[PDB]
Amino acid sequence: SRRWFHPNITGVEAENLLLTRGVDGSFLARPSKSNPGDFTLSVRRNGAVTHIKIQNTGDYYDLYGGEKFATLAELVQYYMEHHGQLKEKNGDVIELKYPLNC
């Protein structure tokens, strides 16, 4: 099922969608435009959206660092369930709370 995955959306559309339809903590995954094969997480937080690159090497998935997973759903679920593990440089967590359905 993977309801949080939006196959046909760009980053600017993801942004607008999270701002209109979501709450802070709402997030979604989409295909990368910047790198075909990869994915991107788009996450609403404090009324704005941050985007996070997801590496698909073919073997495994990760966030260009951090722990590696066999599938996209494993990566997303892991970061939904380990909130301290996803943080920017400044120390703020990027919280994947509420999957925004397509």
Binding site: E15, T50, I52, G65, G66, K87, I94
Partner: peptide, 9 residues
């Protein structure tokens, strides 16, 4: 957009 930089463990 805007791609955030991550701190791992």
């Amino acid at each position: 957009v805007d791609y955030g930089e991550l701190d791992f463990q």
